[PDB]
Design a protein around this ligand. Structure first.
Ligand SMILES: Nc1ncnc2c1ncn2[C@@H]1O[C@H](CSCC[C@H](N)C(=O)O)[C@@H](O)[C@H]1O
Length: 624
Protein backbone atom coordinates (compact mmCIF):
# COMPACT_ATOMS: atom_id res chain seq x y z
CA UNK A 1 0.00 0.00 0.00
CA UNK A 2 1.78 3.04 -1.42
CA UNK A 3 2.96 6.36 0.05
CA UNK A 4 0.18 8.63 -1.22
CA UNK A 5 -2.48 6.42 0.31
CA UNK A 6 -0.41 6.04 3.47
CA UNK A 7 -0.37 9.73 4.36
CA UNK A 8 -3.70 10.78 2.81
CA UNK A 9 -5.82 7.81 3.94
CA UNK A 10 -4.27 5.36 6.43
CA UNK A 11 -2.62 8.01 8.59
CA UNK A 12 -5.83 10.06 8.48
CA UNK A 13 -7.93 7.18 9.86
CA UNK A 14 -5.33 6.49 12.54
CA UNK A 15 -5.43 10.15 13.57
CA UNK A 16 -9.25 9.94 13.70
CA UNK A 17 -9.07 6.99 16.09
CA UNK A 18 -6.52 8.98 18.12
CA UNK A 19 -8.91 11.91 18.40
CA UNK A 20 -11.83 9.63 19.20
CA UNK A 21 -10.16 8.66 22.49
CA UNK A 22 -7.95 11.72 23.05
CA UNK A 23 -10.63 14.43 22.73
CA UNK A 24 -12.81 12.99 25.57
CA UNK A 25 -9.72 12.67 27.81
CA UNK A 26 -8.58 16.24 27.09
CA UNK A 27 -12.07 17.69 27.68
CA UNK A 28 -12.56 15.84 30.96
CA UNK A 29 -9.14 16.96 32.24
CA UNK A 30 -9.72 20.46 30.87
CA UNK A 31 -13.11 20.70 32.60
CA UNK A 32 -11.79 19.27 35.87
CA UNK A 33 -8.99 21.85 36.09
CA UNK A 34 -5.93 19.68 35.37
CA UNK A 35 -4.25 22.35 33.23
CA UNK A 36 -5.41 25.05 35.62
CA UNK A 37 -3.87 23.11 38.50
CA UNK A 38 -0.56 22.57 36.69
CA UNK A 39 -0.57 26.24 35.78
CA UNK A 40 -0.73 27.16 39.47
CA UNK A 41 1.65 24.58 40.96
CA UNK A 42 4.34 24.55 38.20
CA UNK A 43 4.75 20.76 38.52
CA UNK A 44 2.99 17.89 40.29
CA UNK A 45 3.35 14.15 40.71
CA UNK A 46 0.35 11.94 39.84
CA UNK A 47 -0.64 11.41 43.48
CA UNK A 48 -0.67 15.18 44.02
CA UNK A 49 -3.03 15.82 41.10
CA UNK A 50 -5.14 12.94 42.43
CA UNK A 51 -5.42 14.56 45.88
CA UNK A 52 -6.24 18.04 44.55
CA UNK A 53 -8.95 16.71 42.22
CA UNK A 54 -10.24 13.63 44.14
CA UNK A 55 -9.38 11.59 41.05
CA UNK A 56 -9.11 7.88 40.33
CA UNK A 57 -5.36 7.34 40.16
CA UNK A 58 -5.48 4.43 37.71
CA UNK A 59 -7.68 6.03 35.08
CA UNK A 60 -6.06 9.42 35.64
CA UNK A 61 -2.69 7.77 34.96
CA UNK A 62 -3.99 6.41 31.63
CA UNK A 63 -5.07 9.97 30.86
CA UNK A 64 -1.68 11.40 31.90
CA UNK A 65 0.15 8.95 29.62
CA UNK A 66 -2.13 9.97 26.72
CA UNK A 67 -1.57 13.69 27.34
CA UNK A 68 2.20 13.18 27.61
CA UNK A 69 2.21 11.21 24.32
CA UNK A 70 0.40 14.06 22.53
CA UNK A 71 2.86 16.60 24.07
CA UNK A 72 0.09 18.25 26.13
CA UNK A 73 2.17 17.50 29.23
CA UNK A 74 5.86 17.15 29.97
CA UNK A 75 6.92 14.57 32.56
CA UNK A 76 10.17 15.16 34.43
CA UNK A 77 12.59 12.47 35.61
CA UNK A 78 11.34 12.95 39.17
CA UNK A 79 8.00 12.12 37.50
CA UNK A 80 6.25 15.46 37.95
CA UNK A 81 3.88 16.58 35.21
CA UNK A 82 4.58 20.01 33.73
CA UNK A 83 2.61 22.16 31.32
CA UNK A 84 3.88 22.54 27.77
CA UNK A 85 3.35 25.03 24.95
CA UNK A 86 0.73 22.74 23.45
CA UNK A 87 -1.32 22.45 26.67
CA UNK A 88 -3.25 25.59 25.70
CA UNK A 89 -4.64 23.77 22.65
CA UNK A 90 -7.25 22.30 25.02
CA UNK A 91 -8.94 25.70 24.75
CA UNK A 92 -9.41 25.16 20.98
CA UNK A 93 -11.65 22.11 21.55
CA UNK A 94 -15.31 23.20 21.56
CA UNK A 95 -16.94 21.93 24.77
CA UNK A 96 -20.16 20.89 22.97
CA UNK A 97 -18.22 18.53 20.69
CA UNK A 98 -18.64 15.78 23.30
CA UNK A 99 -22.36 15.67 22.44
CA UNK A 100 -21.49 13.76 19.24
CA UNK A 101 -20.73 10.64 21.31
CA UNK A 102 -24.53 10.42 21.83
CA UNK A 103 -25.74 11.92 18.53
CA UNK A 104 -28.08 9.48 16.69
CA UNK A 105 -26.22 9.55 13.35
CA UNK A 106 -28.58 6.86 12.04
CA UNK A 107 -31.61 9.14 12.44
CA UNK A 108 -29.69 12.09 10.98
CA UNK A 109 -28.95 10.21 7.74
CA UNK A 110 -32.62 9.13 7.54
CA UNK A 111 -33.85 12.70 7.94
CA UNK A 112 -35.62 11.94 11.20
CA UNK A 113 -33.96 14.50 13.50
CA UNK A 114 -34.12 18.22 12.72
CA UNK A 115 -31.00 18.94 14.81
CA UNK A 116 -28.13 18.24 12.40
CA UNK A 117 -24.34 18.40 12.29
CA UNK A 118 -24.05 21.54 10.19
CA UNK A 119 -21.79 23.57 12.47
CA UNK A 120 -19.39 20.66 12.94
CA UNK A 121 -19.07 20.44 9.16
CA UNK A 122 -18.20 24.16 9.12
CA UNK A 123 -15.82 23.71 12.04
CA UNK A 124 -14.13 21.00 9.98
CA UNK A 125 -13.89 23.17 6.85
CA UNK A 126 -12.32 25.86 9.05
CA UNK A 127 -9.96 23.09 10.26
CA UNK A 128 -11.25 23.91 13.77
CA UNK A 129 -9.59 27.37 13.61
CA UNK A 130 -6.17 25.93 14.36
CA UNK A 131 -2.92 25.78 12.42
CA UNK A 132 -1.94 22.48 14.09
CA UNK A 133 -2.66 19.99 11.31
CA UNK A 134 -2.79 17.04 13.73
CA UNK A 135 -5.23 18.74 16.11
CA UNK A 136 -7.58 19.44 13.21
CA UNK A 137 -7.46 15.70 12.44
CA UNK A 138 -7.99 14.63 16.07
CA UNK A 139 -11.09 16.85 16.12
CA UNK A 140 -12.40 15.59 12.76
CA UNK A 141 -12.22 12.06 14.14
CA UNK A 142 -14.97 12.81 16.68
CA UNK A 143 -17.32 13.51 13.80
CA UNK A 144 -15.97 11.24 11.06
CA UNK A 145 -15.64 7.83 12.75
CA UNK A 146 -19.35 7.55 13.75
CA UNK A 147 -20.57 9.30 10.60
CA UNK A 148 -18.55 7.16 8.16
CA UNK A 149 -19.43 3.99 10.02
CA UNK A 150 -23.10 4.93 9.68
CA UNK A 151 -22.72 6.01 6.05
CA UNK A 152 -21.29 2.56 5.22
CA UNK A 153 -23.91 0.66 7.24
CA UNK A 154 -26.64 2.27 5.10
CA UNK A 155 -24.69 1.73 1.82
CA UNK A 156 -24.80 5.48 1.16
CA UNK A 157 -21.36 5.56 -0.48
CA UNK A 158 -22.38 3.02 -3.12
CA UNK A 159 -21.57 4.52 -6.51
CA UNK A 160 -24.02 2.85 -8.87
CA UNK A 161 -26.64 5.48 -9.57
CA UNK A 162 -25.06 8.45 -7.77
CA UNK A 163 -23.85 9.33 -4.28
CA UNK A 164 -26.27 10.79 -1.71
CA UNK A 165 -28.94 11.31 -4.36
CA UNK A 166 -31.53 9.30 -2.36
CA UNK A 167 -31.31 11.88 0.45
CA UNK A 168 -33.04 15.21 1.00
CA UNK A 169 -31.46 18.26 -0.61
CA UNK A 170 -30.24 19.79 2.66
CA UNK A 171 -28.84 16.50 3.92
CA UNK A 172 -27.15 15.98 0.56
CA UNK A 173 -25.73 19.52 0.56
CA UNK A 174 -24.23 19.19 4.07
CA UNK A 175 -22.56 15.86 3.23
CA UNK A 176 -21.34 16.96 -0.22
CA UNK A 177 -19.65 20.00 1.32
CA UNK A 178 -18.04 17.82 3.98
CA UNK A 179 -16.84 15.17 1.51
CA UNK A 180 -15.53 17.78 -0.93
CA UNK A 181 -13.77 19.68 1.88
CA UNK A 182 -12.19 16.43 3.05
CA UNK A 183 -11.05 15.51 -0.44
CA UNK A 184 -13.28 12.41 -0.43
CA UNK A 185 -15.50 13.47 -3.30
CA UNK A 186 -15.32 15.82 -6.26
CA UNK A 187 -18.05 17.38 -8.38
CA UNK A 188 -17.26 16.17 -11.90
CA UNK A 189 -19.28 17.32 -14.90
CA UNK A 190 -22.04 14.66 -14.69
CA UNK A 191 -22.40 14.56 -10.91
CA UNK A 192 -20.66 13.98 -7.61
CA UNK A 193 -18.40 10.98 -7.17
CA UNK A 194 -15.95 9.66 -4.62
CA UNK A 195 -12.25 10.26 -5.08
CA UNK A 196 -9.60 7.57 -4.73
CA UNK A 197 -9.46 8.62 -1.06
CA UNK A 198 -13.20 8.47 -0.40
CA UNK A 199 -13.39 5.15 -2.23
CA UNK A 200 -10.63 3.95 0.13
CA UNK A 201 -12.64 5.20 3.11
CA UNK A 202 -15.60 3.15 1.83
CA UNK A 203 -14.00 -0.14 0.69
CA UNK A 204 -11.07 -0.85 3.00
CA UNK A 205 -11.61 -2.48 6.39
CA UNK A 206 -10.52 0.18 8.88
CA UNK A 207 -11.74 -1.15 12.27
CA UNK A 208 -14.26 1.72 12.40
CA UNK A 209 -16.75 -0.44 14.29
CA UNK A 210 -14.19 -1.38 16.92
CA UNK A 211 -13.09 2.23 17.49
CA UNK A 212 -16.70 3.49 17.48
CA UNK A 213 -17.59 0.97 20.20
CA UNK A 214 -15.25 2.79 22.58
CA UNK A 215 -18.01 5.44 22.66
CA UNK A 216 -20.16 4.32 25.64
CA UNK A 217 -17.12 4.46 27.92
CA UNK A 218 -15.67 7.65 26.41
CA UNK A 219 -19.03 9.32 27.08
CA UNK A 220 -18.38 8.73 30.79
CA UNK A 221 -14.77 9.95 30.93
CA UNK A 222 -15.54 12.43 33.73
CA UNK A 223 -17.07 9.69 35.86
CA UNK A 224 -14.07 7.44 35.12
CA UNK A 225 -11.39 10.02 36.02
CA UNK A 226 -13.11 11.92 38.83
CA UNK A 227 -16.23 10.02 39.85
CA UNK A 228 -17.12 6.38 40.43
CA UNK A 229 -15.76 3.96 37.80
CA UNK A 230 -18.09 1.20 39.00
CA UNK A 231 -20.93 3.35 37.59
CA UNK A 232 -19.10 3.42 34.25
CA UNK A 233 -18.85 -0.38 33.91
CA UNK A 234 -22.47 -1.09 34.90
CA UNK A 235 -24.88 -3.58 33.21
CA UNK A 236 -14.70 -13.16 17.93
CA UNK A 237 -11.27 -11.51 18.54
CA UNK A 238 -11.22 -7.72 18.97
CA UNK A 239 -7.43 -7.28 19.30
CA UNK A 240 -6.84 -8.80 15.83
CA UNK A 241 -8.30 -5.65 14.34
CA UNK A 242 -4.88 -4.18 13.55
CA UNK A 243 -3.79 -3.20 10.01
CA UNK A 244 -3.11 -6.81 8.88
CA UNK A 245 -2.97 -10.44 10.05
CA UNK A 246 0.59 -11.27 9.00
CA UNK A 247 1.09 -12.86 12.39
CA UNK A 248 -1.30 -15.71 11.56
CA UNK A 249 0.70 -16.36 8.38
CA UNK A 250 3.72 -16.47 10.68
CA UNK A 251 1.84 -18.90 12.94
CA UNK A 252 1.04 -20.96 9.84
CA UNK A 253 4.77 -21.07 9.03
CA UNK A 254 5.84 -21.93 12.59
CA UNK A 255 3.22 -24.72 12.70
CA UNK A 256 4.33 -26.24 9.39
CA UNK A 257 7.90 -26.27 10.67
CA UNK A 258 6.95 -27.98 13.93
CA UNK A 259 5.12 -30.69 11.97
CA UNK A 260 7.92 -31.04 9.42
CA UNK A 261 10.31 -32.08 12.20
CA UNK A 262 11.78 -35.55 11.84
CA UNK A 263 11.30 -38.18 12.93
CA UNK A 264 7.51 -37.81 13.05
CA UNK A 265 7.18 -39.55 16.42
CA UNK A 266 8.94 -36.68 18.20
CA UNK A 267 6.24 -34.23 17.00
CA UNK A 268 3.33 -33.18 19.26
CA UNK A 269 0.06 -35.10 19.26
CA UNK A 270 -2.27 -32.63 21.04
CA UNK A 271 -2.60 -28.94 20.12
CA UNK A 272 -4.27 -27.27 23.10
CA UNK A 273 -5.61 -23.75 22.42
CA UNK A 274 -6.30 -21.59 25.48
CA UNK A 275 -9.17 -19.28 24.56
CA UNK A 276 -10.40 -21.44 21.69
CA UNK A 277 -13.35 -19.15 20.98
CA UNK A 278 -15.22 -20.54 17.98
CA UNK A 279 -12.45 -23.00 17.09
CA UNK A 280 -11.18 -20.74 14.31
CA UNK A 281 -7.49 -20.94 15.21
CA UNK A 282 -7.71 -24.70 15.83
CA UNK A 283 -9.48 -25.37 12.53
CA UNK A 284 -6.92 -23.19 10.75
CA UNK A 285 -3.95 -25.01 12.29
CA UNK A 286 -5.38 -28.44 11.57
CA UNK A 287 -5.92 -27.69 7.88
CA UNK A 288 -2.38 -26.23 7.68
CA UNK A 289 -0.90 -29.39 9.21
CA UNK A 290 -2.92 -31.52 6.79
CA UNK A 291 -2.17 -29.79 3.49
CA UNK A 292 1.41 -28.59 4.01
CA UNK A 293 3.41 -30.58 6.57
CA UNK A 294 4.97 -34.01 6.55
CA UNK A 295 2.65 -34.99 9.42
CA UNK A 296 -0.32 -34.28 7.15
CA UNK A 297 0.68 -37.15 4.86
CA UNK A 298 0.25 -39.67 7.71
CA UNK A 299 -2.61 -38.47 9.93
CA UNK A 300 -4.13 -41.98 9.78
CA UNK A 301 -0.99 -43.49 11.33
CA UNK A 302 -0.07 -40.59 13.67
CA UNK A 303 -3.24 -38.73 14.65
CA UNK A 304 -3.33 -35.12 15.67
CA UNK A 305 -6.03 -34.18 18.18
CA UNK A 306 -7.10 -30.53 18.46
CA UNK A 307 -8.07 -29.36 21.96
CA UNK A 308 -10.16 -26.24 22.54
CA UNK A 309 -10.04 -24.74 26.03
CA UNK A 310 -12.20 -21.82 27.10
CA UNK A 311 -13.77 -20.48 30.30
CA UNK A 312 -17.12 -19.77 28.60
CA UNK A 313 -19.21 -22.92 28.22
CA UNK A 314 -20.91 -21.59 25.09
CA UNK A 315 -17.53 -21.13 23.40
CA UNK A 316 -16.79 -24.82 23.95
CA UNK A 317 -19.99 -25.75 22.10
CA UNK A 318 -19.40 -23.48 19.12
CA UNK A 319 -15.83 -24.83 19.00
CA UNK A 320 -17.01 -28.44 19.44
CA UNK A 321 -19.44 -28.07 16.56
CA UNK A 322 -17.14 -26.07 14.28
CA UNK A 323 -14.47 -28.83 14.57
CA UNK A 324 -16.95 -31.62 13.76
CA UNK A 325 -14.90 -33.30 11.02
CA UNK A 326 -11.61 -32.88 12.92
CA UNK A 327 -10.37 -35.13 15.76
CA UNK A 328 -10.85 -32.78 18.69
CA UNK A 329 -11.75 -32.43 22.34
CA UNK A 330 -13.27 -29.57 24.25
CA UNK A 331 -12.22 -28.85 27.84
CA UNK A 332 -13.08 -25.98 30.21
CA UNK A 333 -10.18 -23.96 31.53
CA UNK A 334 -8.83 -20.56 32.47
CA UNK A 335 -5.60 -18.86 31.46
CA UNK A 336 -3.91 -18.40 34.77
CA UNK A 337 -5.18 -21.74 36.02
CA UNK A 338 -2.84 -23.94 33.92
CA UNK A 339 -2.28 -26.46 36.73
CA UNK A 340 -6.01 -27.19 36.65
CA UNK A 341 -5.81 -27.60 32.87
CA UNK A 342 -2.99 -30.12 33.33
CA UNK A 343 -4.94 -32.07 35.93
CA UNK A 344 -7.83 -32.08 33.45
CA UNK A 345 -5.71 -33.29 30.50
CA UNK A 346 -4.21 -36.06 32.64
CA UNK A 347 -7.69 -37.17 33.73
CA UNK A 348 -8.33 -37.94 30.04
CA UNK A 349 -5.10 -39.87 29.48
CA UNK A 350 -3.37 -36.98 27.72
CA UNK A 351 0.31 -37.13 28.64
CA UNK A 352 1.72 -33.57 28.98
CA UNK A 353 4.86 -34.60 27.09
CA UNK A 354 2.66 -34.94 23.98
CA UNK A 355 1.18 -31.42 24.08
CA UNK A 356 1.82 -28.19 22.17
CA UNK A 357 0.17 -25.24 23.92
CA UNK A 358 -1.00 -22.26 21.87
CA UNK A 359 -2.88 -19.02 22.47
CA UNK A 360 -3.34 -15.71 20.68
CA UNK A 361 -3.62 -12.29 22.40
CA UNK A 362 -4.82 -13.48 25.81
CA UNK A 363 -2.28 -13.01 28.65
CA UNK A 364 -3.11 -9.31 28.81
CA UNK A 365 -6.74 -10.28 29.40
CA UNK A 366 -6.12 -12.71 32.26
CA UNK A 367 -7.94 -12.20 35.56
CA UNK A 368 -5.40 -10.22 37.57
CA UNK A 369 -4.03 -12.29 40.45
CA UNK A 370 -2.11 -10.24 43.01
CA UNK A 371 1.56 -11.14 43.69
CA UNK A 372 1.99 -14.01 46.14
CA UNK A 373 5.78 -13.59 46.55
CA UNK A 374 5.45 -10.54 48.80
CA UNK A 375 9.22 -10.27 49.32
CA UNK A 376 10.26 -10.79 45.71
CA UNK A 377 7.54 -8.31 44.69
CA UNK A 378 8.91 -5.68 47.06
CA UNK A 379 12.48 -6.14 45.80
CA UNK A 380 11.14 -5.42 42.30
CA UNK A 381 10.02 -1.92 43.38
CA UNK A 382 13.62 -0.80 42.82
CA UNK A 383 13.23 -1.30 39.06
CA UNK A 384 11.71 1.48 36.95
CA UNK A 385 8.81 0.03 35.00
CA UNK A 386 6.41 2.28 33.08
CA UNK A 387 3.53 -0.23 33.04
CA UNK A 388 0.02 1.28 33.42
CA UNK A 389 -2.50 -1.12 34.96
CA UNK A 390 -5.80 -0.22 36.64
CA UNK A 391 -7.78 -2.21 39.20
CA UNK A 392 -11.48 -2.73 39.99
CA UNK A 393 -11.66 0.56 41.93
CA UNK A 394 -9.88 2.71 39.36
CA UNK A 395 -6.68 2.86 41.39
CA UNK A 396 -3.25 2.62 39.78
CA UNK A 397 -1.58 -0.74 40.33
CA UNK A 398 2.12 -0.10 41.14
CA UNK A 399 4.20 -1.10 38.10
CA UNK A 400 6.43 -3.54 39.97
CA UNK A 401 3.28 -5.17 41.37
CA UNK A 402 1.78 -5.48 37.86
CA UNK A 403 5.02 -7.03 36.55
CA UNK A 404 5.39 -9.35 39.55
CA UNK A 405 1.84 -10.50 38.80
CA UNK A 406 2.81 -11.18 35.18
CA UNK A 407 5.95 -13.07 36.26
CA UNK A 408 4.05 -15.32 38.66
CA UNK A 409 1.48 -15.85 35.90
CA UNK A 410 4.14 -17.00 33.43
CA UNK A 411 5.70 -19.17 36.16
CA UNK A 412 2.46 -21.19 36.40
CA UNK A 413 2.57 -21.75 32.64
CA UNK A 414 6.32 -22.43 32.74
CA UNK A 415 5.77 -25.41 35.06
CA UNK A 416 3.36 -27.27 32.72
CA UNK A 417 5.12 -26.42 29.42
CA UNK A 418 6.89 -29.41 27.86
CA UNK A 419 9.47 -30.02 25.12
CA UNK A 420 7.03 -28.82 22.49
CA UNK A 421 6.84 -25.38 24.03
CA UNK A 422 4.21 -22.69 24.02
CA UNK A 423 3.11 -20.80 20.90
CA UNK A 424 2.00 -17.39 22.17
CA UNK A 425 0.95 -14.20 20.40
CA UNK A 426 0.60 -11.03 22.50
CA UNK A 427 -0.07 -7.31 22.08
CA UNK A 428 2.05 -4.69 23.85
CA UNK A 429 1.93 -1.09 24.99
CA UNK A 430 4.41 1.71 24.31
CA UNK A 431 6.03 4.42 26.34
CA UNK A 432 5.02 8.07 25.87
CA UNK A 433 8.53 8.85 24.62
CA UNK A 434 8.11 6.49 21.67
CA UNK A 435 4.41 7.15 20.89
CA UNK A 436 5.49 10.80 20.57
CA UNK A 437 7.82 9.99 17.65
CA UNK A 438 5.37 7.69 15.82
CA UNK A 439 1.94 9.29 16.35
CA UNK A 440 0.96 8.81 12.69
CA UNK A 441 2.44 5.32 12.16
CA UNK A 442 1.18 3.44 15.22
CA UNK A 443 -2.20 2.85 16.88
CA UNK A 444 -0.72 2.85 20.40
CA UNK A 445 -2.16 6.23 21.47
CA UNK A 446 -5.82 5.15 21.35
CA UNK A 447 -5.42 1.37 21.80
CA UNK A 448 -3.23 1.49 24.92
CA UNK A 449 -5.52 4.10 26.48
CA UNK A 450 -8.70 2.22 25.68
CA UNK A 451 -7.39 -1.13 26.94
CA UNK A 452 -5.84 0.34 30.09
CA UNK A 453 -9.15 2.12 30.85
CA UNK A 454 -10.75 -1.35 30.44
CA UNK A 455 -8.60 -2.79 33.27
CA UNK A 456 -6.50 -5.00 31.00
CA UNK A 457 -2.80 -5.75 31.47
CA UNK A 458 -0.58 -4.57 28.61
CA UNK A 459 3.18 -4.30 29.09
CA UNK A 460 6.01 -3.18 26.81
CA UNK A 461 7.43 -5.92 24.62
CA UNK A 462 10.78 -6.03 26.41
CA UNK A 463 9.06 -6.31 29.80
CA UNK A 464 7.08 -9.29 28.52
CA UNK A 465 10.19 -11.07 27.20
CA UNK A 466 12.08 -10.37 30.45
CA UNK A 467 9.19 -11.71 32.55
CA UNK A 468 9.24 -14.90 30.47
CA UNK A 469 13.05 -15.17 30.73
CA UNK A 470 12.87 -14.84 34.53
CA UNK A 471 10.88 -18.09 34.67
CA UNK A 472 12.93 -20.03 32.09
CA UNK A 473 10.80 -19.26 29.01
CA UNK A 474 12.67 -18.20 25.89
CA UNK A 475 11.23 -17.10 22.55
CA UNK A 476 12.98 -19.38 20.04
CA UNK A 477 15.02 -17.31 17.59
CA UNK A 478 13.91 -19.68 14.82
CA UNK A 479 10.30 -18.51 15.23
CA UNK A 480 10.39 -14.99 16.69
CA UNK A 481 8.69 -12.06 14.95
CA UNK A 482 7.79 -8.53 15.97
CA UNK A 483 5.41 -6.00 14.44
CA UNK A 484 5.67 -3.40 13.11
CA UNK A 485 8.61 -4.82 11.15
CA UNK A 486 10.21 -1.52 10.16
CA UNK A 487 9.71 0.83 13.08
CA UNK A 488 11.69 1.04 16.36
CA UNK A 489 8.61 -0.04 18.32
CA UNK A 490 6.87 -3.36 18.96
CA UNK A 491 3.09 -3.73 19.24
CA UNK A 492 2.90 -7.50 18.56
CA UNK A 493 5.26 -10.38 19.31
CA UNK A 494 4.86 -13.80 17.69
CA UNK A 495 6.55 -16.31 20.01
CA UNK A 496 7.40 -19.97 20.24
CA UNK A 497 8.51 -20.20 23.87
CA UNK A 498 10.64 -23.10 25.07
CA UNK A 499 11.48 -24.07 28.64
CA UNK A 500 15.22 -23.86 29.41
CA UNK A 501 17.28 -25.01 32.40
CA UNK A 502 18.40 -21.43 33.21
CA UNK A 503 16.91 -17.99 33.76
CA UNK A 504 17.83 -14.49 32.64
CA UNK A 505 16.91 -11.60 34.96
CA UNK A 506 17.89 -8.00 35.60
CA UNK A 507 21.11 -7.61 37.61
CA UNK A 508 20.85 -5.91 40.99
CA UNK A 509 23.10 -4.41 43.65
CA UNK A 510 23.13 -7.83 45.34
CA UNK A 511 24.78 -9.38 42.30
CA UNK A 512 27.87 -7.18 42.66
CA UNK A 513 29.93 -9.62 44.80
CA UNK A 514 29.59 -12.30 42.11
CA UNK A 515 30.02 -9.74 39.32
CA UNK A 516 33.39 -8.87 40.90
CA UNK A 517 34.46 -12.53 40.66
CA UNK A 518 33.77 -12.75 36.91
CA UNK A 519 36.25 -12.77 34.10
CA UNK A 520 35.66 -9.75 31.88
CA UNK A 521 36.66 -8.55 28.41
CA UNK A 522 37.37 -4.92 29.37
CA UNK A 523 39.38 -3.68 32.37
CA UNK A 524 37.65 -4.93 35.52
CA UNK A 525 35.11 -2.65 37.20
CA UNK A 526 34.93 -2.02 40.93
CA UNK A 527 32.11 -2.05 43.51
CA UNK A 528 31.34 1.72 43.26
CA UNK A 529 31.07 1.71 39.47
CA UNK A 530 28.65 -1.22 39.69
CA UNK A 531 26.73 0.73 42.34
CA UNK A 532 26.29 3.73 40.02
CA UNK A 533 25.65 1.76 36.81
CA UNK A 534 22.84 -0.24 38.43
CA UNK A 535 21.11 2.56 40.32
CA UNK A 536 21.03 4.85 37.27
CA UNK A 537 19.60 2.33 34.74
CA UNK A 538 18.17 -0.48 36.88
CA UNK A 539 16.68 -2.30 33.86
CA UNK A 540 19.66 -2.02 31.50
CA UNK A 541 21.83 -4.92 32.69
CA UNK A 542 20.94 -8.60 32.37
CA UNK A 543 22.44 -11.70 33.91
CA UNK A 544 22.07 -15.40 33.17
CA UNK A 545 21.51 -17.46 36.28
CA UNK A 546 21.79 -21.23 36.52
CA UNK A 547 20.90 -23.09 39.73
CA UNK A 548 21.81 -19.92 41.62
CA UNK A 549 25.18 -19.43 39.92
CA UNK A 550 25.88 -16.22 38.10
CA UNK A 551 27.09 -17.53 34.75
CA UNK A 552 27.22 -14.33 32.69
CA UNK A 553 26.13 -10.73 32.67
CA UNK A 554 25.93 -8.03 29.99
CA UNK A 555 25.81 -4.30 30.77
CA UNK A 556 24.19 -2.01 28.21
CA UNK A 557 23.63 1.69 27.61
CA UNK A 558 21.03 3.50 25.46
CA UNK A 559 22.47 6.42 23.47
CA UNK A 560 22.03 8.57 20.29
CA UNK A 561 18.85 10.18 21.64
CA UNK A 562 17.64 6.73 22.71
CA UNK A 563 17.91 5.04 19.31
CA UNK A 564 21.12 2.97 19.66
CA UNK A 565 21.56 0.18 22.22
CA UNK A 566 25.21 -0.49 23.03
CA UNK A 567 26.97 -3.21 24.99
CA UNK A 568 29.59 -1.91 27.42
CA UNK A 569 30.54 -4.90 29.62
CA UNK A 570 30.53 -8.69 29.21
CA UNK A 571 31.12 -10.78 32.34
CA UNK A 572 31.53 -14.58 32.42
CA UNK A 573 32.23 -16.97 35.32
CA UNK A 574 34.60 -19.40 33.53
CA UNK A 575 34.46 -21.85 36.46
CA UNK A 576 30.88 -22.65 35.39
CA UNK A 577 30.46 -25.67 33.10
CA UNK A 578 29.30 -24.85 29.54
CA UNK A 579 29.59 -21.12 30.21
CA UNK A 580 30.54 -20.57 26.56
CA UNK A 581 27.20 -21.84 25.28
CA UNK A 582 25.42 -20.09 28.16
CA UNK A 583 27.20 -16.79 27.47
CA UNK A 584 26.27 -17.06 23.79
CA UNK A 585 22.65 -17.70 24.85
CA UNK A 586 22.64 -14.57 27.00
CA UNK A 587 24.03 -12.64 24.02
CA UNK A 588 21.37 -14.02 21.67
CA UNK A 589 18.74 -12.98 24.20
CA UNK A 590 20.19 -9.46 24.46
CA UNK A 591 19.74 -9.20 20.71
CA UNK A 592 16.08 -10.18 20.88
CA UNK A 593 15.50 -7.96 23.93
CA UNK A 594 17.08 -5.03 22.05
CA UNK A 595 14.99 -5.65 18.95
CA UNK A 596 11.80 -5.09 21.01
CA UNK A 597 13.12 -2.35 23.30
CA UNK A 598 10.98 0.77 22.64
CA UNK A 599 12.83 3.29 20.48
CA UNK A 600 15.96 1.20 19.75
CA UNK A 601 16.82 1.40 16.04
CA UNK A 602 20.15 -0.49 16.02
CA UNK A 603 22.48 -2.45 18.32
CA UNK A 604 26.27 -2.11 18.75
CA UNK A 605 28.63 -4.81 20.03
CA UNK A 606 27.00 -8.09 18.94
CA UNK A 607 29.72 -9.08 16.46
CA UNK A 608 32.47 -7.96 18.85
CA UNK A 609 31.45 -9.98 21.91
CA UNK A 610 30.16 -13.00 20.03
CA UNK A 611 33.62 -13.25 18.45
CA UNK A 612 35.29 -12.84 21.86
CA UNK A 613 33.37 -15.82 23.28
CA UNK A 614 33.20 -17.82 20.03
CA UNK A 615 37.00 -17.88 19.71
CA UNK A 616 37.60 -17.48 23.41
CA UNK A 617 40.84 -19.46 22.76
CA UNK A 618 42.74 -16.37 23.96
CA UNK A 619 42.46 -15.54 27.62
CA UNK A 620 42.87 -11.90 26.76
CA UNK A 621 40.17 -11.61 29.40
CA UNK A 622 40.84 -10.04 32.78
CA UNK A 623 40.65 -12.20 35.91
CA UNK A 624 41.44 -15.50 34.14
N1 LIG B 1 -9.68 -15.82 31.24
C1 LIG B 1 -9.93 -16.60 30.20
N2 LIG B 1 -9.65 -17.95 30.27
C2 LIG B 1 -9.93 -18.76 29.19
N3 LIG B 1 -10.48 -18.25 28.03
C3 LIG B 1 -10.75 -16.92 27.95
C4 LIG B 1 -10.49 -16.08 29.03
N4 LIG B 1 -10.86 -14.83 28.68
C5 LIG B 1 -11.35 -14.86 27.42
N5 LIG B 1 -11.29 -16.15 26.94
C6 LIG B 1 -11.72 -16.63 25.61
O1 LIG B 1 -10.77 -16.29 24.61
C7 LIG B 1 -11.42 -16.13 23.36
C8 LIG B 1 -10.73 -15.05 22.52
S1 LIG B 1 -8.93 -15.29 22.40
C9 LIG B 1 -8.54 -13.52 22.36
C10 LIG B 1 -9.75 -12.62 22.18
C11 LIG B 1 -9.56 -11.14 22.52
N6 LIG B 1 -8.69 -10.51 21.54
C12 LIG B 1 -9.06 -11.01 23.96
O2 LIG B 1 -8.26 -10.12 24.28
O3 LIG B 1 -9.44 -11.79 24.84
C13 LIG B 1 -12.88 -15.83 23.66
O4 LIG B 1 -13.73 -16.71 22.97
C14 LIG B 1 -13.04 -16.01 25.16
O5 LIG B 1 -14.16 -16.82 25.49
Amino acid sequence: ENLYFQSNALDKINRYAHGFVAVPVICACSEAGVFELLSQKKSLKLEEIVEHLAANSGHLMVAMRLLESLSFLYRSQAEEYILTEQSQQHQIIPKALMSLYKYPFELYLKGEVETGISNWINCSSRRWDTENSLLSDLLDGVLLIPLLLELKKQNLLDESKKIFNTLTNSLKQELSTLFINLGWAEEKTEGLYLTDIGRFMRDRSLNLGTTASYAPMLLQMKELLFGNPQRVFQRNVVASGFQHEKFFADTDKIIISIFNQQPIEEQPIYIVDMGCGDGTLLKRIYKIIKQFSARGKVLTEYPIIMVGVDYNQEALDVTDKNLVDIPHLVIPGDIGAPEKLLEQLKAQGIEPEKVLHIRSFLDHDRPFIAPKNTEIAQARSQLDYQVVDVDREGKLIPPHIAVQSLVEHLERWSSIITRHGLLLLEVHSLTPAVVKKYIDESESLHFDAYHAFSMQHLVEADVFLMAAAEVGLFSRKEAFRKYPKTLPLTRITVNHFEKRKYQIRYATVNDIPNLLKCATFNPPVNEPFFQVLLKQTPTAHLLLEYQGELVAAIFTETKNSNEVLGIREFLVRTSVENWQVLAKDLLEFVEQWGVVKPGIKEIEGLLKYHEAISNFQKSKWYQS
